[PDB]
Every structure is written in C-alpha cells, then in structure tokens.
Amino acid sequence: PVHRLAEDFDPFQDAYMADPAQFVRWAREQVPIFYAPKLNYWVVTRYDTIKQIFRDPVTFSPSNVLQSFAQPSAEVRQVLERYGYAFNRTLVNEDEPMHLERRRVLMEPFASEHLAEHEPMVRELVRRAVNRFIDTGRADLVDQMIWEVPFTVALHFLGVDDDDREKMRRFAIAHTVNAFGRPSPEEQLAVAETVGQFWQFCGEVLEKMRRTADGPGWMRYSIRQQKLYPDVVTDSYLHSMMQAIIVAAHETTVFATTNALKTLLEHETVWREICADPSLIPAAAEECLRYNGPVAGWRRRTTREVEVEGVRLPVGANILMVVASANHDSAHFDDPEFFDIGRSNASEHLNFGYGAHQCLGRNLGRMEMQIMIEELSRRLPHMRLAEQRFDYLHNVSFRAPRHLWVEWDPAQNPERRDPDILRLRQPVRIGPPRAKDVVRTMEVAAVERPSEDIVVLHLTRPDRRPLPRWSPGAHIDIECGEPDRSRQYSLCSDPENRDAWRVAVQRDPASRGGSRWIHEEVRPGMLLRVRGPRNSFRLDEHAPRYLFLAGGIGITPIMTMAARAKELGTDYELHYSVRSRTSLIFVDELRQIHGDRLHVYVSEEGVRNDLAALIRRASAGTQIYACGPQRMLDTLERLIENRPEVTLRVEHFFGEPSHLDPAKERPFQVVLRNSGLTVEVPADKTLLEVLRAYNIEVQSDCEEGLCGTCEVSVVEGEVDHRDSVLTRAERRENRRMMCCCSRAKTERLVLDL
Ligand code: HEM
Ligand SMILES: Cc1cc2nc3c(=O)[nH]c(=O)nc-3n(C[C@H](O)[C@H](O)[C@H](O)COP(=O)(O)O)c2cc1C
Ligand code: FES
C-alpha cells in the first residue's frame, strides 16, 4: 500500500536515521514524489529530480533549510526573546541574488592552497589520538579521535578560542536539534534555553573578534570584508553564521568519517584492500560518501508554482529531498547497493549539494576523512567492530552513529614489528579523485585468440569474488602498460553475471601503442589495471522497436543491447557485417540467442548490407543503435537527418584524438550560470583545466575527445567542437560540449554548471 506509506511517513525514527535510502526505497522505485502529512512536506527521492532542484535556487529557495519542525510556543518565543535570539540567514539558507554575492565576497579562504595548509595539523592530531589508545585493544573511535580532529581543525579555521569543549558540544547539540530535529513539547523549553545561550556566546565571540579584526580565521576575515561590503556582510549575517558555522564546520565531517569507518569495517575484503594499498583511500572515501554518506535529507521551498515529477506544486510548498536516496538511485549509479570502491562516478554523490550552494568546506572534509582512514588502516588493520547497538540522534538532515566501538589484539599491532610504518605518508587528494585514482586490479582469467588480430579477454577479481553489475553499452578502460595509455573497450559479457567481464580487443594496424601492447603482452594470469565500468552509450529500454547495426569489432556493445532487447521482449533485428570470415566473433553464441533475428554479411564473399534500403523500410518509432567504422556511422546519420520519425544513436571507436595546439587557438570566456562565476580560458588551457582550477567538479577520462565523460551543458554561445563523440546534429544544437577539448566560436559561452 504505497498510499499508506506516504500517509505514515515520518523520518524522526531510527529506521530513517540508520538507512534512509532503504527507508524510502519504495518511493524511489514507485512514487518519486508524495505528500507527507505528518510533516506538511513533499518528499522527492530520485537523483535527476534532486539535481535539477539544486540547479535552480530562484525557484527552489533554501529558506527552510534551517527551519525547526516545532510550533514555537509563546513560551519558547519568550525564552528565546530573553537572549535577543535573532538567527536569520547565513549562507546555506540565503536567497538569491544576495547569496551568490556574499559567497563571492567570503569564499576566498576556502581555496585549495589555504586548505592544503591544514594538512600538517590534521596529521599531527590524528597521530596524537591513535597514540593514546593503540595498546589498549578496545576503543570508541568517535570519542577517542573522530570527533576531536574536525572539531579542533574547525575552531582553528574559524579563529575561535578552544577552551570549553563541554559547553561547545552542548551548544552544538541544541543548535542541531533546533534546526533539523523535532523535540517533543516537554523538551522544547530546555532546548530553547541552550540555543539562547549559544546565540549570546556567539555575540561575545563576535565582539572580541571585532576588537582583534586583524587576527586569524575566517570570521575575522568576514569582519574585515564587512568594512568593504556593509550591505552584503551584515551584522545579522555575521552573528547567525557564527552560530551555524561552529557546528557545520565539524559535525558533518565527524559523521562522514564515522560512517566511512563503519562501512569499511563491515566489508572486510575492502578494508583488507585499503590496508595493503593506501592509494585506494581517496576512491574508497568517495564511495563511502555515496554508499553511507552523512546527508539524509535536505530541504527547499518553492517560490512559484512549478511542476515536479509530474505534479503541480503551489507556491510555498515544502520539499524534502532525500539525498541518501538519490545516492542509491539505479538511474545514475549501476548496481547501487554494491559497495564498490572502484565505482568510477562515485564522486557524483550529492552529499555536498550541487551548484550555487555547493559545500565550501568539502575538500577539507575529504582531506580529514582520508588522513583518519589512512592512519587507522596502517596501524590497526586487524581491528574489527565490537558488538554494540548503534544510536543515532534524530534529525532530518545529518546521520551517523554516536559511537563506534572497535577491538583488536595489540600484540599483533604491525608497528611493533615495523616501527617505520609511522614514517609513511600517503599524499593527500585535494578534491574528488581523478580517473587514474579510481582503478581496480584485475586478473586475466582466460585469453582466446579467434583470429590473428582479435583477442578476447575474460577478466575477474584476483580472488574471484563478485564484480558489480553494469548496463548494456558500458565500457572499461585498460591501462595498456602505463596509467596514461588507457584505452576504452566495450563490455560484452552478460551484464548481470558478476563472475567475470569479457572484452574483445582488435589489434589496430596503426596502433598508437595500446592495442599493440595488449596483443603483445597479455596472457592468462596477468594482472591488469582497469577503470570503469562507465556507460556513455545507454540503451533506451522503452523504445517500441530496435534496429541494431554492428560493423566489425563494433559488435561488442551492440550485442549486449540486442540481448537486452530480447529479455525485455521488444522487437529487434541484429545486423552484423565483417570483411573477412575469420573476423567473425561470437557468431555461434549470437545464433543461439537471436536465431532468425541475426543477419551476417561477409564482404570478402561479396555480400554487403545495403543501409539505405534497410533504413527506408524502418517504421516510425524505431530506435537504431549502431557501432562501426566512421564512414558507416556518417552514412546512417545522413540517412536519418531526413527521417525525423526514427532516431539514431551511435558509438564511435575510431575517432581522431584531439590535441590542443595553443598557437592556433584564442582565449574565450565561460559563464558558469549555476555557480555564479565567470572565468577566462586562455589559448594554452583547455576548458576542463580551467574548471578544475576554480574547483568546479567535472569528471574526465581520456581527456582527448574520444570517450565523452567530460560533457557539459551549454545554454548560450556557439561551440567550436573538437571531440569525436557528437553527431553533426548534436554539434549544431550547441547544447552538449566535451570540455576536455572543445572551445568557442563566440567570444563567450554560458554553461549550466
Ligand atoms: C565533510 C562533510 C560535509 C558535508 C557532507 C557538508 C554538507 C554541506 C551541504 C549539504 C551544504 C549545502 C549544499 C547545497 O545546498 O547545495 C553545505 C554548504 C556549506 N558548507 Fe558543508 N559539508 C561538509 C563539510 C563542510 C566543512 C568542513 C565546512 C567549513 C569548514 C563546510 C562549510 C559549508 C558552508 C560555508 C556552506 C555554505 C555554502 C553556501 O551556501 O554558499 N562544509 N555543506
Ligand atoms: C567507447 C569506446 C569503446 C571502444 N571499444 C572497443 C572495443 O570493444 N574493441 C576494440 O578493439 N576497440 C574499442 N575501442 C577503440 C579502443 O579504445 C582503442 O582506441 C583502439 O584499441 C586503438 O588503440 P591504440 O591506437 O592505442 O592501439 C573503443 C573506443 C571507445 C571510445
Ligand atoms: S574526457 Fe574523454 S571526451 Fe573529454
């Protein structure tokens, strides 16, 4: 009864604190928006919907982000009024256009080079913490380390004197309950009193800072910015922010790190991998954020009528975005319940939000997670979770257990046998991990050589444990002898078969070295560094009819799509053309599966597939999926550019790599509309490199126009396309753009970033 579940929905309970993505799985799957009467909120649960809401803060205001779920009684008001409580807007809950202007004025101390200066402090505090308890054999990781490290760092970043932690903790709990919780009525007056005391304590801190405004920390810097921008950095802002940022600057980092260590210790195989290889830590942390992140729900309120998930919402409608649900959305993350530290798009999780309000401290929080995981993985690889109950403080937005008890045998501490482990340091990842940071080590279980220039590889985990599932069209990248010679190969095994992955690698007659290395070097039992899967050629599973066209080695993604069409029961034909009979691969398998829906054309025997004839017989609604040589794909796109009632999707294997030659190029201007930022791209930089340098997070893989991972959305201007992914019609729309290589025809571009 999905209508009953909506009626009863109530996040203030252990089940939603413990696993909010499971708690709303029914809605993510079947009811992507519902009204929750116990809250007076609309609840949304899918990744695409939540990302769009984040993109549009004019329509979807963050005004209710810090809003209490209580009354307030006149007694509560009166308690609050005694302290002059006037908490108003900070950054996270501020409306446009004021928000972006204040962010612009205040964001500089959050720059990479400043945040990297805190590394020594984080390392020293983590080392101190673990030294205290390393020999005990039992410890609560939260009260012994994970809470104090971000707390200490945060107050130092802020310039707040750190001398009364029991009072600060008391203050932080009350603020959090007040902002995100639902205290019962018999408890609200005590909460209100502590909130008032926190407000007045922040008044005192602020007044001491005003008289030392040249001292350190971000709050004194905001006071100095007030002198220059008094209408932007107000007294109301400064006082409200002081209270909110004392909590925000540590609590969520504590929670993320608590959740990460719990998830890692619950997956012994993965924990053992990290303990043998610290370079996995940036990718493992991102997937901990994706899989078990500290953000449950986040809020917005409509400022106009708007349709959402096919429902027309009135003005002022409250929306709860279940961010944890989005991070488990199978439409964006294949096999989302699989905890996969090789997951190549893990950093697309929404724990840091997206666009205008995107978390300013996120790379400091990442660094703290990484160094804490590192220290524990080096010194306590043999610890395990003790038996315990996990207790969660109820609130709608942030979730972690309050304690994390672990136990180990100190006589097995590896530093006793090898004390120089204490001198090792894994250099820290600033920002999300790059593609070459997200790598799985695989074993070549078998190698078949059906023809002189095709090798079929069967790839498994070295331990043969299960692999994540993928979806038709996905590819992996194999590092062909070095990390900077990575090549894409389409997965062509069964996407649900977790035992192994199959690829077929053609030896290229003019190899730049990649497929040549595979043909000269790969043998069963070898270990390969593999990235992905990533899917840039997804099958629309709701088409009425399919036409699948494979030219040569282009059969590899196409055959996974034809197998899927069969399983869905949709009408399809599979046409497979080769030059030499010896180049046929998988034909016996394909005949068994597809029967009389398979058509094979061997051109050395004089047989070819007349595409103009085959397309003019295609009926309206048909989706054509094709992979083959460049000339075959051009032909299909000329034929389809005059048949609007059929659609074409192509994947290019043989594009020409892009290469920036700055002598032939010009600077251009890019406006990031959602981030409220305008940057210049000089002649010697790609757009991708400039986005990274402004900490705009964009995923990339080949970085040379071939794989399409770096695509961004253009809303104004004319693109000078340099990639090999887009069709001509796509190029002419001036919407999609590969930022690793493409530039501008107009002087400026406007991006939806
Ligand atoms: C480590 C885990 C962290 C998480 C999960 C987290 C979460 C968030 C979220 C969800 C937002 C709102 C995003 C949006 O609406 O688009 C946010 C904003 C913000 N965060 Fe974080 N945060 C973390 C760490 C930090 C740290 C360590 C700091 C400060 C040192 C911090 C400072 C801020 C600020 C100032 C904003 C306001 C940005 C704005 O509205 O323009 N965050 N954070
Ligand atoms: C998305 C994508 C999928 C590809 N799939 C395959 C494949 O399944 N088999 C293959 O031989 N080449 C495939 N290629 C081409 C290879 O990635 C690679 O360019 C080719 O092996 C030539 O590399 P080389 O010049 O270094 O030898 C694919 C390319 C792309 C962009
Ligand atoms: S990263 Fe491969 S196309 Fe840009």
Numbering used by the authors: 27 to 779
Lines from the paper:
In the other class of self-sufficient P450s, CYP116 P450s contain an N-terminal heme domain fused to a phthalate dioxygenase-type reductase domain that consists of a NAD(P)H reductase domain and a [2Fe-2S] cluster-containing domain (ferredoxin) at the C-terminus. The electron transport chain of these P450s is NAD(P)H→FMN→[2Fe-2S]→heme. Notably, CYP116B46 from T. thermophilus is a highly potent and thermostable protein. A more recent report describes its activity in catalyzing region- and enatio-selective C-H-lactonizations of saturated fatty acids.
The crystal structure was determined at 2.13-Å resolution. The electron density map showed a continuous chain from residues 27 to 779, and the corresponding protein model was built unambiguously. The ferredoxin domain is located between the heme domain and the reductase domain, packing against one another. The interfaces between the domains are mainly constituted by hydrogen bonds and salt bridges and the buried areas are: heme domain and reductase domain, 835.1 Å2; reductase domain and ferredoxin, 619.8 Å2; heme domain and ferredoxin, 580.6 Å2. The binding sites for each of the prosthetic groups, heme, FMN and binuclear Fe-S cluster ([2Fe-2S]), were found in the heme domain, the reductase domain, and the ferredoxin domain, respectively. An imidazole molecule was modeled into the electron density map because a high concentration of imidazole was present in the crystallization solution (0.1 M). Notably, the C8 methyl group of FMN is very close to the Fe2 of the binuclear cluster (7.9 Å), a distance that permits an efficient electron shuttle between the redox centers in an iron-sulfur flavoprotein reductase of the phthalate dioxygenase system. In contrast to the close proximity of FMN and [2Fe-2S], the edge-to-edge straight-line distance between the [2Fe-2S] cluster and the heme group is 25.3 Å.
